[PDB]
Design a protein around this ligand. Structure first.
Ligand SMILES: [Ca+2]
Length: 82
């Protein structure tokens, strides 16, 4: 049964997850990609996205992507780098 979106009275996904076109919560491209209804910027962060911080304690890379790798947390990291 739909848990988010227009078919769920406008409910948003917990932990900032993306709501797919069909009303389900997730973080893969099938949820955040084409057709995404809400909280679709889950993987983006930083100055290009209103200064948004990543969920799950992920680092925000210099290019505005959320992750845990050295490339996300090292040189240029914008937030939650350690
Ligand atoms: Ca941390």
């Amino acid at each position: 049964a739909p848990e988010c979106g227009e078919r769920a009275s406008g409910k948003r996904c917990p932990n900032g997850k993306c709501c797919s076109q069909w009303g389900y919560c997730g973080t893969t491209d099938n949820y955040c990609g084409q057709g995404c209804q809400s909280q679709c910027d889950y993987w983006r962060c930083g100055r290009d996205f209103g200064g948004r911080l990543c969920e799950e304690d992920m680092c925000c890379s210099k290019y505005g992507w959320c992750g845990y790798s050295d490339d996300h947390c090292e040189d240029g990291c914008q937030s939650q780098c350690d």
